Design a protein around this ligand. Structure first.
Ligand SMILES: [Mg+2]
Lengths: 247, 51, 180, 116, 40, 319, 229, 152, 27, 174, 326
């Protein structure tokens, strides 16, 4: 039967490793009955060759998939029902994208410096996520110096003063505060796996894809169980992957 | 909040570097230590008021 | 302390009050608006030719393109730039010796320079404010408190003076055999 | 077949400054610090209740714009430009944004109505 | 500015202000908590 | 405060009263009316056993509901039941309406029905709003419905906190009669996009494209994208590649779409001068009618793909 | 770069200076600088010997030569200055305020004052071997406090738009007439007993960790072990 | 269509290598045929031209000088009542008792600012500074006051 | 007035610009 | 020569990658004695205390190299035994006194007496008494500390260097 | 065996070719040598002039003949107007690119063509030893400026992996549909859905005017909340309402036209198989074809697709005449 779900968006920053594995897992468990669109912000990449091999160990072939942005789906943001943001945690996030991640803030229970859980609260889970880092969109602008309003020497359409006029094709990022308009909105915190650290073996870099695979198997099982109580239908049609996951 | 921060600062290896904006004051005298050329003590063209 | 109070700019404790570090603007449009980090009084002196106490610098709130990207490429060099001049010695003199006041915008600006901690109004909205109980605080204080002389010596180094001579320097500064 | 420009030995015939051709990288504040949305509590269960609790001033008619938002998340995600394009006056949208940012910091709108 | 919440002591007075500055002990306790967080 | 009264208990009538009993924390008084008093007592007992925060009343006639409640909301099964309850009964809600009452009808009725209901309510002094529901019964239980309210503007602004208790998307179409037309246009676009998706996937199988899972990804990012194209294509793939396979039954059926499409041709003006001033609308309607009488009426809306050529049978022979 | 509707000229000299024929000492300085200079410098000479990688070779001569030559007027053994980073002062609020230094853009801060901001001492105020160097800081958008680059330090002064393509300082004569004597530097008579500022700066430089273990002539020894003894 | 009209009515192709001037000049070894054009320009400009002092250097003496070697000895004379007022002010500023608002190092500071402001510190100032620094237990600062007295 | 300030350098006899002007006004 | 920008290629591989181009030829050898000792001590940290047969057993148990992975001996992924105190899990105890001597040398702005670093070194040995009694007054540990002394002035002769180092060599053997 | 840059050429400066060339001139930072071809050299000079004054990061080179464009480029990308110009530039000319292709070249066609043209182009490119990819583009020139174009690459997968860094400079959604001819069929299906959804939205807004709904934007929000949402409806509904409420108002000219969509649907009809010597019936698609033909026969084919509305019943006139003839 045609399902009542209008679509599933898997938002990311690069659409390279984690969102490609999440599209492959969610398509198998729903048996292709639900439209699933996985996209990112920076589309200038290919699917990682370890992301295809690790998914091939289960039997999922994501080699037919492709890296694509969500720019076609930002105009149709109100038409999709489910919105998933797969991004790294803000305590472990690094902006250079060339180092291993930092250590999170540790709290006391019942040598890293542990904090008090009453003095340092832990961002309680009943709150919602308004905008994520995956909720941006690209904005291309060009200020050409052949426009006589920009070529004039007293003009604010330049990012300098005395060097030149205009600016050739600069890119800025907007915000998309429409993830709360979706019916089901979740955020999945997973570490980065698409960038290899300073010196690290191929067996150790592949192991991070295996650990990111088991987290995506658990989170997709919790997502589809929530959506089965939301719509009221059966969305875990193929349970051949879950019997290896439960056992 | 002071002791936990000072222990975390002493265990951290990155923020143990010296900071010239925080560690010291470079100069506290009212006059600079070397001559920058100024003043001129003379007039120029179009200046009638001298001194 | 007037009969008819100036309704638009009220202050505290009369004029001229404590010296305060402010970020004053110009009467121009936003696209050419810049700010001056200045030290002035609590009430602005409009009857003087000396309208400020000290000028700490100029902040440009518009981001500039990084014109120095091919010099030495470091991490996050091609991002935009916010240019500001900060008089370090005059700020430390008016902050420590004269004990001036601070608005929240110069505090947030100087926290970016490494001179001050982040301000009280710079809120991390994902982390709530702490909750204090005296029993847990007493247990943590009795778990690890510093020694009395060590605390006194670190206070003496931080507040009183930090250049205290060693014994190897006292043995060097003392006179020698023709006078000793 | 010809190269563009009469010089034909230069990479750029107009010879601009090489800092013009330098790229500009970008990073949103959403990558630095996220924005969370608190759920409605028992004190403010709806968004019209949140607007009526914030109406304390005569010149800030906050309770006049209950129809300007669809639900709680639309009230708590709109910035001041989106309040401006919805047709809200300046003091009213400033009071709305201040009440939203105070509720985000942990301060519910508990203030005395100073109208009478 | 000193905040006047709705659950303060109301002054039933037609010749002045309608709400006093007399708090609740919960307001005293949470003000002490905010005082310590500023004291750090 | 305002007293609210919900009339009619069916498959869709119960969760509106359940959400009005849940979210109204004893501020707005709740009254329940039904076609039978036993069903009203049953739904009142069901609201009583699971936790009721507000007092609720049970009535067997519309007169006490009129004299007690300010706001009356109706959720019935068919058009003729709402026409009997609102206008044709002796103790009618609109013919005996109080001045200042607000009567909202959530049934998909014709345009003339909403027009005469608004006319009788405007002569009585009340305000009539037509707001037909779009959504699932479980989505109504979770609080997600689409409402297109037509009526007065300030009356619509008075009904926004009541409409937000059981619906997320509540829009104002304008004057009365514009809310009941929006559901007709919406289901007409649903039928047209379903027929277009069936024809497009039939031509995709005719051209010999073997990978449809990548075809929907590019077709969603093109200008010929639609939500029905995302919905029906995994079922349409199996219905095309296995034409002997019977389509499965769904919640939404061909007859459920044709029941709302049967209101549109009565609410439209006379087409007999040009005989077809709506090409793809009748091109989808004939395919749905050919799918209905062949035994596939109760099944899913993806059954149009076997009756695409049957939509040409009423065009070659009738001309 | 030439614009369309206007005519341009050519500068005869870069600076308004006094001629070297006006004095014998300026003449001898010019002749001694020309002997210590090349006539034509190419890609293989000693001022271009810092290009040890072909990637640096394609970076310097390709697409940024007009920026790389405009860094410093005189040709030196490099193109700029090495970048070093500073330590962050401890924020006693802890992780409540650890997010606030990270921002969108780079925040550049420069020093001003009485001692700082004079262009005539500009190459003295950007000298890394000067204890009173003009302090610059740049907070990155990820919160890192680093120093400024050489062009970043030179951007805060007046423009210096000339370049020296001849003089190479390792070719200076040092054996016959250029002989700096230690007795000429001893004529200033720098003494530590008559002025205590140098020893005070040395005391301000050294760590003060001994003040906590003062009572723990007494001299500091290694910790004596009792488990192995 | 809005880009098809805006042509290159602003820029021009760059100067080739070994090009001549628009006035006909050229950078040769012989500049007798070449001329200067500084005398054809207007004499004063409101503002600063992009070529105004673009390459202007200063003397080496500014960058080879030591610290505080440019200060000439100026005999700043004043009234004797001003001498009494400033001596009493510096003597009261030295003798401030070290509480929570005053560290004892200020007793060494107000002597030093007495010499920076070109005053001759009398013997009572040295006596008060040494007694104030001995009362706070700062003996090396008192010996530094003695060395300040000897270096004057 | 009508003449620019660079007129005496442009039209000086013997210059490149003056010879170009005389060559184009009389080929 | 330049390739198409793909897979989000980084501009620089390190913070100080292009800062080494901004040093002289002697300053690249001055920092080579400092940074090269820091790289070498961190590479052999995980195999510290291993015998020659146990090091060869590490390279034998991992025989899968894609030619992008380096030698498994350098920066090994083996589990350490004492596994450590706080800071010493990345560098040895000899490097802790090496890093404290470099920190004094950077702030002293040149040559400096041994008394500036005496209180820095005895605080480490008081904190790690097990690593102190293993390595004190040995030829390997003393030589690795005083290795960074000719960075202060590399053109000095052996007579000036051994005179300056003798104040450091006596306290490390006392 | 010289380590050098990639010679990339763009043939045809038209509606969509010049933003492709501008994106390749901006976003390729000294990694390619750009060639620009046109029939008139003044247009290529204009495009290179605007790229030079706006500030490009690569060196550019104009061409006026296909022989130098063949012998210079390693990668050729064609963005032309119609199938006839693409068939002339690729196969019919004496100096055409595929007929004179060198060993190892890669030719990508962005012009939407028929199936047999792409089949013969890929066959002759494989015969010459080169590679051919057909990647019909979907998007507006404003969407081409922002780098958001839709590409359906048919051809070799390794060539697709090679050409992805060039495709990601002006397109975000780039899919590999499979063998040669798959992307052309995908473009045909996409434009068939475009015409069908345009006719559906036209009838929807005519129903909205006939039933008395004043504003269209709230109807667009209602349809976005429900299942009746489509891209062409949200694209056309303000102009559809302004054309229906003002029934004498002439539509504006857009980048897409009735003639271009009719040419692409004619390619689809030529590529669609028949059953039993007769055409397979599709009622909604034939109804949209009748409306587009009635809009094009009145001289209103150069304007936007919304121009079908004033002729939609006229399309039925076109069928009704075809009923009365025996
Ligand atoms: Mg994708």
């Amino acid at each position: 039967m045609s399902t009542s779900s209008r679509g599933i968006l898997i938002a990311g920053l690069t659409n390279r490793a984690r969102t490609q594995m999440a599209e492959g897992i969610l398509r198998r468990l729903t048996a292709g009955t639900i439209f699933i669109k996985s996209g990112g912000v920076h589309h200038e990449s290919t699917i990682h060759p370890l992301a295809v091999k690790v998914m091939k160990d289960i039997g999922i072939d994501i080699s037919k998939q492709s890296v694509t942005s969500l720019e076609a789906a930002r105009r149709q943001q109100n038409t999709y029902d489910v919105y998933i943001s797969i991004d790294c945690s803000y305590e472990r996030r690094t902006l250079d994208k060339s180092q291993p991640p930092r250590a999170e803030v540790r709290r006391r229970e019942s040598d890293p410096v542990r904090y008090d859980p009453l003095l340092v609260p832990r961002t309680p889970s009943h709150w919602s996520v308004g905008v994520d880092a995956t909720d941006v969109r690209r904005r291309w602008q060009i200020w050409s110096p052949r426009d006589p309003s920009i070529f004039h020497e007293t003009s604010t359409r330049k990012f300098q003063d005395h060097l030149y006029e205009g600016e050739p094709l600069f890119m800025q990022l907007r915000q998309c505060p429409w993830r709360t308009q979706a019916k089901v909105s979740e955020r999945w915190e997973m570490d980065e796996v698409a960038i290899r650290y300073p010196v690290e073996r191929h067996s150790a870099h592949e192991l991070r894809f295996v650990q990111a695979r088991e987290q995506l198997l658990q989170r997709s099982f919790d997502l589809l169980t929530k959506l089965e109580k939301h719509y009221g239908e059966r969305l875990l049609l193929d349970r051949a992957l879950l019997e290896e996951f439960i056992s | 909040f002071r002791d936990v921060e000072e222990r975390r600062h002493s265990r951290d290896v990155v923020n143990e570097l010296p900071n010239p904006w925080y560690d010291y004051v470079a100069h506290a005298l009212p006059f600079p230590d070397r001559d920058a050329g100024y003043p001129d003590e003379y007039g120029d063209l179009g200046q009638w008021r001298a001194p | 302390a007037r009969a008819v109070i100036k309704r638009r700019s009220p202050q505290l404790w009369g004029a001229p009050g404590a010296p305060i570090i402010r970020m004053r603007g110009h009467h121009v449009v936003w696209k050419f608006q810049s700010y001056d980090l200045v030290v002035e009084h609590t009430h602005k002196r409009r009857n003087s030719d000396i309208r400020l106490l000290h000028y700490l610098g100029k902040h440009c709130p518009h981001p500039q393109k990084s014109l120095w990207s091919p010099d030495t490429p470091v991490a996050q060099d091609r991002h935009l730039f916010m240019l500001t001049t900060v008089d370090i010695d005059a700020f430390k003199y008016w902050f420590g010796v004269k004990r001036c006041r601070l608005s929240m915008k110069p505090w947030a600006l100087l926290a970016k320079a490494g001179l001050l901690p982040p301000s009280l109004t710079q809120n991390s909205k994902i982390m709530p404010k702490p909750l204090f109980d005296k029993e847990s605080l007493m247990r943590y204080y009795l778990a690890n408190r510093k020694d009395e002389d060590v605390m006194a010596r670190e206070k003496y180094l931080n507040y009183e003076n930090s250049m205290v001579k060693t014994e190897e320097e006292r043995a060097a500064e003392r006179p020698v055999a023709p006078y000793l | 077949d010809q190269t563009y420009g009469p010089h034909k030995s230069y990479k750029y015939t107009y010879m601009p400054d090489p800092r013009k051709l330098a790229p500009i990288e970008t990073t949103q504040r959403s990558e630095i610090v996220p924005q969370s949305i608190r759920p409605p509590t028992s004190y403010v269960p709806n968004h019209e209740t949140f607007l009526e609790r914030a109406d304390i001033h005569r010149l800030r008619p906050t309770s006049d714009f209950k129809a300007s938002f669809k639900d709680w998340n639309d009230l708590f995600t709109c910035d001041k430009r989106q309040l401006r394009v919805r047709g809200i006056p300046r003091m009213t949208r400033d009071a709305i944004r201040t009440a939203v940012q105070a509720f985000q910091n942990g301060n519910p709108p508990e203030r005395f109505d100073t109208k009478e | 500015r000193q905040i006047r919440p709705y659950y303060n002591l109301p002054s039933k007075s037609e010749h002045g202000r309608k709400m006093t500055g007399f708090l609740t002990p919960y307001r005293h306790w949470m003000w002490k908590q905010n005082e310590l967080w500023r004291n750090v | 405060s305002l007293n609210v009264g919900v009339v009619g208990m069916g498959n869709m009538g119960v969760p509106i009263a359940r959400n009005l009993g849940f979210k109204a924390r004893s501020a707005m008084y709740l009254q329940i009316h039904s076609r039978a008093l036993s069903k009203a007592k049953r739904v009142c007992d069901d609201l009583s056993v699971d936790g009721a925060t507000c007092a609720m009343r049970i009535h067997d006639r519309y007169s006490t509901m009129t004299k007690w409640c300010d706001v009356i909301v109706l959720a019935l099964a068919d058009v003729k039941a709402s026409r009997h309850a609102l206008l044709e009964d002796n103790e009618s809600l609109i013919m005996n309406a109080r001045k200042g009452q607000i009567i909202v009808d959530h049934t998909t009725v014709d345009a003339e029905t909403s027009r005469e209901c608004a006319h009788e309510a405007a002569r009585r002094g009340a305000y009539f709003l037509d707001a037909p529901m779009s959504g699932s019964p479980r989505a109504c239980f979770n609080g997600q419905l689409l409402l297109m309210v037509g009526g007065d503007a300030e009356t619509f602004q008075k009904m926004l906190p009541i409409f937000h208790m059981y619906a997320d998307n509540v829009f104002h179409m304008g004057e009365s009669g514009s809310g009941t037309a929006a559901k007709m246009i919406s289901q007409a676009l649903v039928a047209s996009h379903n027929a277009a998706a069936a024809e497009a996937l039939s031509m995709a199988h005719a051209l010999g494209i073997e990978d449809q899972s990548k075809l929907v990804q590019v077709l969603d990012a093109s200008w010929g994208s639609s939500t029905m194209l995302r919905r029906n294509a995994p079922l349409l793939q199996d219905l095309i590649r296995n034409p002997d396979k019977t389509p499965p039954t769904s919640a939404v059926s061909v007859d459920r779409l044709l029941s709302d499409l049967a209101h549109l041709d009565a609410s439209l003006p006379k087409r007999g001068g040009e005989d077809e001033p709506f090409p793809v609308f009748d091109a989808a309607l004939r395919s749905l009618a050919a799918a209905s009488d062949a035994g596939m009426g109760d099944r899913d809306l993806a059954s149009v793909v076997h009756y695409i050529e049957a939509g040409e049978a009423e065009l070659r022979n009738r001309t | 770069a030439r614009k369309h509707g206007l005519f341009y000229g050519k500068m005869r000299f870069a600076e308004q200076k006094i001629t070297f024929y006006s004095d014998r000492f300026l003449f001898r300085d010019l002749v001694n600088r020309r002997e210590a200079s090349y006539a034509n410098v190419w890609e293989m000479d000693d001022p271009y010997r810092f290009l040890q990688t072909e990637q640096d070779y394609e970076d310097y001569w390709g697409d940024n030569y007009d920026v790389y030559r405009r860094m410093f007027p005189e040709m030196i053994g490099r193109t700029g200055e090495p970048v070093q980073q500073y330590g962050q002062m401890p924020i006693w609020a802890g992780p409540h305020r650890q997010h606030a230094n990270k921002s969108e853009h780079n925040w550049m801060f420069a020093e001003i004052g009485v001692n700082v901001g004079h262009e005539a001492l500009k190459k003295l105020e950007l000298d890394p071997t000067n204890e009173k160097r003009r302090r610059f800081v740049i907070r990155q958008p990820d919160g890192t406090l680093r120093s400024a680059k050489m062009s970043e330090m030179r951007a805060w002064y007046w423009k210096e738009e000339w370049a020296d393509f001849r003089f190479w300082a390792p070719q200076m004569e040092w054996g016959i007439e250029n002989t700096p004597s230690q007795e000429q530097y001893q004529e200033h008579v720098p003494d530590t007993t008559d002025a205590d500022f140098r020893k005070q700066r040395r005391i301000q430089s050294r760590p003060v960790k001994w003040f906590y273990e003062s009572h723990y002539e007494r001299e500091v020894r290694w910790p004596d072990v009792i488990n192995a003894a | 269509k809005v880009d098809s009209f805006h042509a290159n009515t602003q820029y021009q192709h760059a100067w080739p290598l070994l090009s001549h001037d628009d006035l006909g000049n050229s950078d040769q070894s012989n500049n007798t045929k070449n001329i200067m054009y500084s005398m054809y320009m207007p004499k004063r400009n409101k503002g600063t031209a992009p070529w105004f002092r673009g390459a202007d250097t200063y003397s080496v003496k500014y960058c080879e000088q030591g610290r505080y070697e440019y200060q000439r000895y100026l005999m700043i004379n004043r009234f004797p009542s001003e001498y009494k007022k400033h001596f009493l002010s510096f003597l009261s500023n030295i003798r401030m008792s070290s509480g929570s608002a005053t560290i004892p190092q200020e007793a060494l500071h107000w002597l030093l600012r007495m010499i920076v402001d070109n005053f001759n510190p009398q013997h009572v100032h040295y006596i008060a500074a040494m007694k104030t620094l001995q009362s706070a237990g700062e003996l090396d600062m008192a010996r530094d006051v003695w060395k300040i007295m000897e270096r004057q | 007035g009508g003449v620019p300030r660079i007129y005496y350098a442009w039209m000086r006899p013997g210059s490149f610009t003056r010879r170009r002007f005389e060559k184009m006004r009389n080929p | 020569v330049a390739k198409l920008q793909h897979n989000s290629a980084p501009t620089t591989l390190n913070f100080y990658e292009k800062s080494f181009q901004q040093l002289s030829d002697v300053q690249q050898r001055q920092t080579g004695l400092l940074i090269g000792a820091a790289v070498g001590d961190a590479a052999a940290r995980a195999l510290d205390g291993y015998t020659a047969e146990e090091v060869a057993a590490v390279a034998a148990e991992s025989g899968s190299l894609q030619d992008e992975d380096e030698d498994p001996v350098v920066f090994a992924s083996v589990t350490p035994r004492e596994h450590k105190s706080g800071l010493l899990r990345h560098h040895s105890y000899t490097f802790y006194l090496f890093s404290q001597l470099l920190r004094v040398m950077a702030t002293s702005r040149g040559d400096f007496p041994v008394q500036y670093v005496k209180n820095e070194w005895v605080a480490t040995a008081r904190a790690h008494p097990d690593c102190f009694v293993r390595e004190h007054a040995s030829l390997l540990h003393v030589l690795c500390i005083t290795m960074q002394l000719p960075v202060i002035y590399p053109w000095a002769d052996d007579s000036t260097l051994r005179e300056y180092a003798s104040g450091f060599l006596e306290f490390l053997t006392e």
